[PDB]
């Protein structure tokens, strides 16, 4: 009908998709409505009504299959190409006519472009020519055949180049044509012509301030180094001013993939202040914010350009200007959140800045990102977040890292970077050996909270967590084996968590674990040995029942003494063995009677009854007095 149409374009208070119900009868709608559109679109209406028209037309256009019923739309669309407000709506409407009638819609377009060209030639003014280039730049990426043929025709080149020579002072003509050149670069044949016949024109138009941005855009796409450097320098300079934000942001995001661009950008202090200000500003578009975050993450990234310069930038422009702390109170989409995590990761590559990151709330941002993706996408971004989290939990006190929130909610993610029982394995996260090492360092720090009770409760709630730790007891990597033993030694400060895994001698699996642990006392890695000794010393000096059983284990006692005879020069290892041995010897006089005639053991104890080490003389005396007990 015709009143349905007035409702669709009358006011924004209408839902065109809802009106479809009024467009029930296929024909009436497939006909009258189309006829009403043909008669209505024969004039140009206000941008409000035009917006609603080209928001509804695509729907009906997609459904119709008869071409003779949608053929008029090509002229209607192409004749509105100079109306900048509806250009994206016109493109969608033309794309709607691509699914069907593709061949007939391109041929109708060419016949109109050819007619438009003749009108431009006969027009003493510039408006017909602007309309032709605007029609071409609108429909170029979907009608390449007829658009390439028009652009490359001598009749079109002739009128274009001549009007760029005579009317250089017409910014709407020049900037319309610069957009056509840039859009048309999607075709290789067109790019070659522009890179072979427009370099001079572009050199002149680069001298005019209001043509610079679009000229540099064309020059970027026509690049088959001062040609590039002058173009980039324009993008940086224009962006620091605050103008043409969408174009410079999209251009600089792709350009900052090259190190030389990053160095140039990092050296321009004016644009770095502007990028941080724009990100913090509540006025900038989400599309611009995403690009601004992409540039910053690209420029803040550590290489695998100088590191100290990148580190100096991250401190002076991201950390100094509180970029991270403001990201907490800004609306971020998933893709911008991905770059924010990427920026946090980049800054944490310098451990001196980790404390500032945590103060600015980076920990909570990693945690919330990980929780939101936990059941959604364990992708490369999910892994990157854990990497940043591991490095954070290594260098800062855990209790101060998550806004007074328990740092143990991080535990599950760290466990994800630890190899699972081979029986299962196959983890989306492609964590490396270094990731496992770093997660284990972080878990060891989490194990320091409340004598390990809190992390122990998490390990006890999921047998998969303990299996993962046990699987690394004999890892081929020294640093992973060392960090695993350290983790266990902290968890042995309270027997609730994992003491049964090693000291339940009635369980064969646990008893075999104990025998393995005993043998690990003679590992070649001193850090590992200290931790193994700490495991034993911790529970022996804390649980009398376990201490009593340990005091009856001949292989533990002989191994500890053997290690003591040969490595007592290492302070930490010595103290830990002395605590273990005095605990054992105080519980078992018959163990003492075994060693009462060990000459080398006694003399090594006597030398230490004489640094910040008060436990060594005290425990040596106590053990020697117990041996004296067995003699007098």
């Amino acid at each position: 009908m015709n009143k349905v149409w007035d409702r669709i374009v009358g006011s924004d208070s209408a839902d065109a998709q809802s009106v479809l119900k009024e467009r029930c009868s296929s024909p009436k709608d497939v006909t009258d409505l189309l006829h009403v559109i043909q008669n209505w679109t024969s004039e140009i209406h206000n941008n409000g009504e035009e917006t609603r028209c080209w928001k509804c037309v695509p729907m009906l256009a997609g459904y119709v299959k008869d071409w003779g019923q949608l053929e008029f739309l090509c002229r209607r669309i192409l004749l509105r190409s100079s109306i900048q407000e509806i250009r994206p709506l016109l493109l969608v409407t033309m794309k709607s006519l691509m699914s069907n009638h593709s061949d007939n819609t391109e041929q109708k377009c060419g016949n109109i472009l050819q007619q438009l060209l003749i009108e431009a030639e006969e027009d003493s003014g510039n408006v017909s020519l602007r309309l032709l280039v605007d029609a071409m730049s609108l429909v170029f990426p979907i009608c390449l055949g007829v658009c390439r043929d028009m652009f490359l025709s001598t009749d079109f080149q002739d009128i274009l180049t001549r009007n760029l020579n005579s009317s250089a002072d017409d910014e709407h003509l020049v900037n319309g044509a610069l957009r056509l050149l840039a859009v048309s670069c999607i075709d290789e044949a067109v790019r070659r012509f522009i890179a072979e016949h427009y370099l001079k024109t572009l050199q002149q138009s680069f001298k005019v301030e209001k043509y610079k941005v679009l000229t540099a855009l064309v020059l970027i796409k026509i690049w088959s180094k001062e040609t590039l450097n002058s173009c980039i320098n324009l993008f940086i300079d224009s962006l620091s001013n605050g103008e043409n934000i969408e174009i410079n942001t999209e251009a600089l995001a792709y350009l900052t993939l090259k190190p030389s661009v990053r160095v140039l950008l990092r050296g321009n202090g004016d644009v770095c202040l502007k990028i941080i200000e724009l990100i913090k500003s509540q006025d900038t578009t989400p599309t611009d914010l995403y690009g601004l975050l992409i540039i910053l993450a690209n420029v803040s990234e550590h290489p695998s350009e100088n590191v100290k310069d990148i580190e100096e930038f991250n401190r002076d422009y991201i950390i100094d200007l509180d970029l991270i702390g403001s990201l907490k109170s800004i609306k971020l989409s998933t893709s911008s959140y991905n770059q924010a995590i990427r920026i946090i990761y980049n800054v944490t590559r310098d451990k001196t800045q980790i404390s500032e990151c945590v103060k600015q709330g980076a920990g909570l941002m990693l945690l919330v990102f990980l929780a939101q993706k936990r059941n959604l996408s364990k992708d490369e971004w999910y892994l990157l977040s854990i990497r940043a989290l591991s490095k954070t939990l290594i260098y800062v006190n855990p209790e101060t890292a998550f806004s007074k929130y328990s740092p143990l909610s991080a535990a599950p993610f760290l466990f994800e970077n630890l190899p699972l029982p081979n029986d299962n394995a196959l983890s989306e996260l492609q964590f490396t050996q270094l990731d496992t090492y770093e997660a284990l360092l972080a878990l060891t720090n989490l194990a320091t909270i409340n004598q390990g009770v809190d992390l122990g409760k998490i390990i006890l709630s999921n047998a998969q967590y303990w299996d993962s730790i046990e699987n690394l007891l004999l890892d081929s990597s020294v640093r992973i084996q060392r960090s695993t033993l350290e983790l266990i030694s902290n968890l042995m400060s309270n027997p609730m968590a994992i003491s049964a895994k090693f000291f339940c001698f009635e369980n064969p699996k646990s008893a075999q674990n104990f025998e393995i642990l005993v043998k690990l006392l003679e590992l070649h890695d001193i850090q590992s040995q200290r931790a193994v000794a700490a495991i034993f010393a911790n529970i022996a000096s804390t649980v009398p029942f376990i201490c009593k059983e340990l005091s009856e284990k001949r292989n533990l006692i002989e191994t500890a003494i053997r290690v003591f005879k040969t490595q007592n020069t290492d302070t930490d290892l010595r103290i830990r063995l002395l605590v273990l041995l005095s605990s054992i010897f105080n519980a078992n006089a018959h163990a003492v009677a075994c060693v009462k005639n060990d000459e080398e053991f006694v003399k090594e104890l006597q030398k230490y009854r004489n640094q910040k080490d008060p436990l060594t003389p005290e425990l040596s005396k106590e053990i020697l007095s117990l041996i004296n007990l067995e003699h007098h």
Binding site: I394, Y395, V396, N397, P398, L441, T444, N445, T448, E486, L487, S489, N490, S493, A531, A534, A537, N538, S541, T542, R576, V579
Partner: peptide, 7 residues
């Protein structure tokens, strides 16, 4: 008693 910490 014996604690390993990296921070």
């Amino acid at each position: 008693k014996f604690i390993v910490s990296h921070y």
